[PDB]
Amino acid sequence: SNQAVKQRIRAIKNI
Amino acid sequence: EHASRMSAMENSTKSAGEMLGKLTLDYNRKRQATITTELIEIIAGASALM
């Protein structure tokens, strides 16, 4: 569950 | 139109920096908690042998 919170920082940083 | 999109896309970089700030605090908490969890799993397996 530590990659689902790391792939959201992938999303919000490019948005 | 271009001057309301400019005020809308500056209200959504604020919202994607406030969400990113709450998500890095949440990630640093999970980063700290998973180093403590994987360490307790190592000491328990070592104390069961020593």
Partner: protein
């Protein structure tokens, strides 16, 4: 009959250390002098470690431990059908002893390569989200992995209830006898399933192996193997079985309790190193045997609970590696009104369409393709950007198709009805219909279409060209709501 005697050295937390018993085998049933049974698990050089099948309060220091000579076994046979047994054989439904039964071992070597054949015939769940997208053959282990309350049990119960509907219509050879192993569950919960299975009639073909939460941790560790041994009677004698291990997640926790109290060193999440071998020993006994060995099958349904959709869990990752398919059930799909909440993008079946209905192998191929086109176009109209009118066609048709896969929890549809329902949605006949009443439109599509056109599709197993036109010419002489 010389009986070896072991003196209890210390007893605590359901584990008793026993001095002596040098002759005892590993995995041998022992007998305490309090009447409570035990199993010798780790034979150390100075003592024996015994897991206690029951409450360890009756065992004192210096009690006499007798060995029974035998590895742990359970009564198998047709006399177990209809009865509710405990973790190792013994019936708890208050209906006397198990008549017409035979004691066989619970830890059997799984059938090897030369004893198999290919999984070709289908096991119909009755859940049309399953039988179309992730179809399950006879001899295939399929995981029902999901969240805490995602209807995982409902998918498994509908497989058991549907076999009773199939067993009244098939000949004697191809009848499926179900076994439901409930591990670590509430006893009230188990009693609601025996109440359901006698009301349905499914209890004629069902064995209910119950290791509740009050039972000892070696009774819940051992109950999947004892239920599989009861289920392997039908596989070994040419008949067909269906074993459901509800919460193998709760079997591993009961096995972690005995391992941690027999002092075995803890692994990831304080779990035993051989935990993978705990479930791969069990699930590899679900096989489709060759015709030299009878042709019998055993179909497994392990149930694994995840925490927050975390399939990256230690025990969850182990069972996804062992099983063939996977029925992933999602929480947010459950509350969006999609019941059963099956994640079609994450649910696979490794046997595939080789062991499914031919009358849905041609119809549900475009179903899973139009649903694959529905998924990514719904992520983009989630924002509200723009429309294409060919994007909006697959976004509108897949909304009929998602609404078509919804099903009632306690009613399992026959395979012939599911194919007709999927035909009416994939051949455009359920267009001109609002997206909201397709849950009620298909009651017309099953009732008004002739009851003798299901018989031809059941007997042929396939929409012939003399039936492919005849039923689409009956899918126009039907009255749909709204229209």
């Amino acid at each position: 009959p010389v009986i070896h005697l072991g003196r209890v050295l210390s007893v605590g937390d359901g584990i008793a250390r026993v001095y002596g018993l040098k002759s005892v085998q590993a995995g041998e049933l022992v007998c305490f002098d309090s009447g409570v049974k035990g199993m010798a698990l780790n034979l150390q050089a100075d003592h024996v470690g015994v897991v206690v099948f029951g409450n360890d309060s009756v065992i004192h220091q210096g009690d006499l431990v007798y060995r029974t000579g035998q590895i742990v076994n359970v009564p198998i046979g047709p006399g177990t059908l209809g009865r509710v047994t405990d973790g190792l054989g013994q019936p708890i439904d208050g209906k006397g002893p198990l008549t017409n039964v035979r004691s066989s071992l619970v830890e059997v070597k799984a059938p090897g390569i030369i004893a198999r054949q290919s999984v070709r015939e289908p096991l119909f769940t009755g859940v049309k989200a399953v039988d179309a997208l992730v179809p399950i053959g006879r001899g295939q282990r399929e995981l029902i992995i999901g969240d805490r309350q995602t209807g995982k049990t409902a998918v498994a119960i509908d497989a058991i209830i549907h076999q009773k509907n199939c067993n009244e219509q098939v000949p004697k050879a191809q009848r499926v006898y179900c076994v439901y192993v409930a591990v670590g569950q509430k006893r009230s919960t188990v009693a609601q399933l025996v109440k359901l299975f006698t009301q349905t009639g499914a209890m004629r073909y069902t064995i209910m192996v119950s290791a509740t939460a009050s039972d000892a941790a070696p009774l819940q560790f051992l109950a999947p193997y004892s239920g599989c041994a009861m289920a392997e009677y039908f596989r070994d004698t040419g008949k067909h079985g269906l074993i459901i291990y509800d919460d193998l997640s709760k079997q591993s926790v009961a096995y972690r309790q005995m391992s941690l109290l027999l002092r075995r060193p803890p692994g990831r999440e304080a779990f035993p190193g051989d935990v993978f071998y705990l479930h791969s020993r069990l699930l590899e006994r679900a096989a489709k045997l060759s015709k030299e060995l009878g042709g019998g099958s055993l179909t497994a349904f392990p149930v694994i609970e995840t925490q927050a959709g975390d399939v990256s869990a230690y025990i969850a990752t182990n069972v996804i590696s062992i099983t063939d398919g996977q029925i992933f059930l999602e929480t947010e799909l459950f509350y969006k009104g999609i019941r059963p909440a099956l994640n079609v993008g994450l649910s696979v079946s490794r046997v595939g369409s080789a062991a499914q209905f031919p009358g849905m192998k041609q119809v549900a191929g475009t179903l899973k393709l139009e649903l694959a086109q529905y998924r990514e176009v719904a992520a983009f109209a989630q924002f509200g950007s723009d429309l294409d009118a060919a994007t909006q066609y697959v976004l509108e048709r897949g909304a009929r198709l998602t609404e078509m896969l919804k099903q009632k929890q306690f009613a399992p549809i026959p395979i012939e009805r599911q194919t007709v329902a999927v035909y009416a949605a994939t051949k455009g006949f359920l267009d001109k219909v609002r997206v909201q009443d397709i849950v009620a439109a298909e009651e017309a599509v099953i009732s008004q279409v002739n009851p003798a056109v299901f018989k031809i599709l059941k007997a042929n197993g396939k929409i012939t060209p003399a039936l492919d036109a005849h039923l689409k010419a009956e899918l126009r002489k039907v009255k749909l709501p709204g229209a």
